[PDB]
Design a protein around this ligand. Structure first.
Ligand SMILES: *[C@@H](C)[C@H]1/C(=C/c2[nH]c(/C=C3N=C(/C=C4\NC(=O)C(CC)=C4C)C(C)=C\3CCC(=O)O)c(CCC(=O)O)c2C)NC(=O)[C@H]1C
Length: 172
């Protein structure tokens, strides 16, 4: 699995040429590990082999990853603002899909990325419909907005990858 993913992040990155693209596996406890990381160069430190703090993924958001497989952070310049204080939640039948087009992100995570030297982050999961094995995230040091064309690229590869991680798991 590791070898496959590592090969996936390196090759895919070459196509996106994005400052940094990595795969993030989710552990039932929340302790996920970087099993795939690509970088343009020694410009941005490598987070490979490092462990992220458990709980990095909130509650309302993580549930969306399982429901809509669609998340992205907008240019910090436009300064999207949000509050970690949501009103109730949707029902099983209802599937909330970013009511607004600006889907503002609370400041806590925005400045967090600023600390990472990132302005806009895109997320295109590499997993199943009702089950999340991991998450893919791309970093672009530009205030430019996200385009559907970007989705076209990962849509075909992500689906083939999400399948790879699923098929590879059977080995063990
Ligand atoms: C601050 C109190 C907390 C918080 C809230 C929060 N998180 C997001 C957005 C995202 N979080 C990430 C982070 C990652 N990038 C990575 O490199 C990795 C792998 C190690 C992760 C998991 C990203 C890219 C997202 C998804 C984009 C999105 O906006 O959904 C959100 C949005 C959810 C919402 O609207 O409430 C917020 C506001 N982040 C924390 O970790 C807490 C400390």
């Amino acid at each position: 699995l590791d070898q496959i993913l590592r090969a996936t992040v390196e090759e895919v990155r070459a196509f996106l040429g994005t400052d940094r693209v990595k795969v993030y596996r989710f552990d039932p406890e929340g302790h996920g590990t970087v099993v795939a990381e690509a970088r343009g160069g020694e410009r941005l430190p490598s987070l490979l082999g490092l462990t992220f703090p458990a709980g990095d993924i909130p509650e309302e958001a993580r549930r969306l990853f399982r429901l809509a497989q669609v998340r992205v952070i907008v240019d910090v310049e436009a300064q999207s603002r949000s509050i970690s204080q949501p009103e109730s939640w949707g029902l099983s039948a209802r599937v909330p899909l970013g009511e607004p087009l600006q889907r503002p992100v609370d400041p806590c995570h925005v400045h967090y990325l600023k600390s990472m030297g990132v302005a806009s982050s895109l997320v295109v999961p590499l997993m199943h419909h009702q089950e999340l094995w991991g998450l893919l995230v791309s970093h672009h040091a530009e205030p430019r907005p996200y385009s559907q064309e970007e989705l076209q690229v990962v849509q075909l590869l992500a689906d083939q990858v999400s399948i790879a991680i699923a098929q590879a798991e059977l080995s063990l």
